[PDB]
Paper text:
We obtained triclinic crystals for MurK (termed MurKapo), which contain four protomers in the asymmetric unit (ASU) that form two biological dimers. A detailed Cα-RMSD analysis of all four chains in MurKapo showed that both protomers of a dimer possess a virtually identical conformation that is slightly different to the second dimer of the ASU. The dimerization interface of the apo enzyme buries a surface of around 1160 Å2 and involves just two residues (F34 and F35) of the N-terminal domain, whereas all other contacts to the adjacent protomer were made by several locations on the α-helical insertion of the C-terminal domain. These include residues in the helices α4-α9 and the loop region in between β8 and α4, as well as residues in the loop region α10 to β9. Soaking experiments with MurKapo crystals using MurNAc failed, probably due to a rearrangement of the N-terminal domain upon substrate uptake ultimately leading to severe crystal damage. The induced fit of MurK can be visualized by superposing the C-terminal domain of the unliganded MurKapo (“open” conformation) to its corresponding C-terminal domain of MurK/MurNAc (“closed” conformation). The best fit utilizes residue range 106 to 266 and results in a Cα-RMSD value of 0.67 Å for 152 aligned residues, showing virtually identical backbone conformation of all the aligned residues of that domain. In the open state, the adjacent protomer does not contribute to the neighboring active site, but the induced fit accompanying the MurNAc uptake enhances the reshaping of the active site by rigidifying the dimeric interface with additional contacts from the N-terminal protomer.
Unlike other bacteria, the pathogenic Tannerella forsythia, a member of the red complex group of bacteria associated with the late stages of periodontitis, lacks biosynthetic pathways for MurNAc production and therefore obtains MurNAc from the environment. Sugar kinases play a crucial role in the MurNAc recycling process, activating the sugar molecules by phosphorylation. MurK and K1058 are two sugar kinases of the cell wall recycling system of T. forsythia, sharing a sequence identity of 44% and separated by a single PGN-scavenging operon within the genome. Structural and sequence data showed that MurK and K1058 both belong to the group of ribonuclease H-like kinases and are members of the ASKHA (acetate and sugar kinase/hsc70/actin) superfamily.
Author numbering:
A (entry chain A): 2 to 279
B (entry chain B): 2 to 284
């Protein structure tokens, strides 16, 4: 049996494959080693992963997660080693490489993540050969859920979208300006708060201000990130909730900027299953 | 004697006026009642204001500071009353009112602050009648020192401005990306860190991409804040370090958007002195 994980901001998605079949699909909390200690990760595995596994024993583990850079790989691997009995290999790498394997397989492409955060890289068919550091929801992460949320809230409360959308938004999420400021500046994981109010955009996509905010945000991600790669030579592939929920707009953004899209999918898990059983 | 104060994020600027003459000039830390307790404020005053005064007796005190919303007015007043011996009025109001009195006196006008943060309002000649909530360095505060810094760092690290400026910046400030990320996302007062590195812009304003970052930041401020008021009728006055150090580009931004500018000054102290000496002199 093999265990596969893609760990993002809000969640870790796990699949168990055996004899090329899916025999388990599991959500846990996100497991980013910058935000939690090994002890916390190990306890989270024990609490919420193990109860949905049919064994502690795996041939292979492939764990892909935000924040799993070379510095942090050993730490994560030792947690996985301590919790599971792995006979052969324990791969730990980034969510970016998950998306690349999922979307490109063994051939090159430009690969982007558009979820709570965003990211972009060039995958040479084996590994990530180049990348644009995302920089997070304040400084960067163009086109991300948290950035979309940031932009939306700023425009709403600044009376740039009119009174209808502003009041609809505040009433829908039962927010006040004061609540929002508190959340965004003085409460943990503002990026997750902002990404969680971002679905308003998809719900209201037919309104001009809403369409423009998304289109402009996407064009910004493309010009600032994807266009640093050789985008006239390679397809650009997109993985994540935002790539999927705003697919038509992403395609409009790509056509406006000259980018050639490949795969646009919700998450890398479907790709990885194909990757590991073919 | 009268005591005047303008409290901002980085510092509180104090003046002592004696019969229209400036006889004392003092900096302390900023005294935003949302960021410190009344006890912490009182101690800061005893530790840093009182030793710079040769007297604590005043006829009037006018304290203007960020965070001094009506709800916090008596909290602040009582802190000052404790420390200072005052015979007439202790007025406590917002830094926005300081800027307004400083630039407008008794006349109406659009009043803007551009420092570490930014803010805009319509002053009717007596008080702030309307305001655009600035929203902080993440959501808004367009054209502020914090947002200029945010724009600069994102552009530099995302290779938008070339290697030269990128290297020059990291070198000058002894920074590395992972260090910046730490300061911006995981450490206290990221806005102050971002404002603190924004001077790089003034220093390199001859660079076309730096000039352009600042122009577009400023245009964003004007379109998103100032233009919600009756800008085709009233002058927009600008008070702050950013207004001052980037005056020419602010003037350029205003010409481009159709805003008629009024006062552009470093800080409101010069204005408040005139205010209290002339146009609003107690007789």
């Amino acid at each position: 049996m093999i265990l596969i994980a893609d760990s993002g901001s809000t969640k870790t998605h796990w699949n168990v494959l055996d004899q090329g079949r899916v025999i388990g699909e599991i959500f846990t909390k996100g497991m980013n080693p910058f935000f939690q200690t090994p002890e916390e990760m190990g306890r989270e595995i024990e609490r919420t992963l193990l109860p949905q596994l049919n064994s502690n024993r795996f041939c292979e583990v492939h764990f892909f997660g935000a924040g799993c850079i070379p510095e942090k790989v050993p730490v994560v691997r030792n947690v996985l080693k301590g919790c599971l009995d792995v006979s052969s290999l324990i791969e730990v790498d980034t969510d970016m490489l998950a998306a690349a394997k999922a979307s490109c397989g063994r051939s090159p492409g430009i690969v982007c993540i558009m979820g709570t955060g965003s990211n972009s890289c060039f995958y040479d068919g084996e590994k990530i050969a180049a990348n644009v550091s995302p920089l997070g929801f304040i400084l960067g992460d163009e086109g991300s859920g948290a950035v979309l949320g940031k932009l939306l809230i700023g425009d709403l409360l600044k009376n740039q979208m009119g009174e209808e959308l502003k009041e609809k938004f505040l009433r829908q999420y039962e927010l006040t300006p004061a609540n929002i400021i508190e959340r965004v500046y003085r409460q943990p994981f503002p990026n997750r708060f902002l990404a969680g109010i971002s679905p308003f955009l998809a719900e209201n996509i037919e309104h001009p201000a809403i369409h423009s905010l998304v289109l402009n945000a996407f064009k910004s991600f493309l010009t600032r990130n994807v266009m640093q790669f050789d985008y006239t030579r390679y397809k650009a592939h997109f993985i994540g909730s935002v790539a999927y929920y705003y697919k038509d707009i992403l395609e409009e953004a790509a056509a406006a900027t000259g980018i050639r899209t490949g795969t646009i999918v919700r998450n890398p898990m479907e790709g990885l299953r194909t990757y590991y059983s073919t």
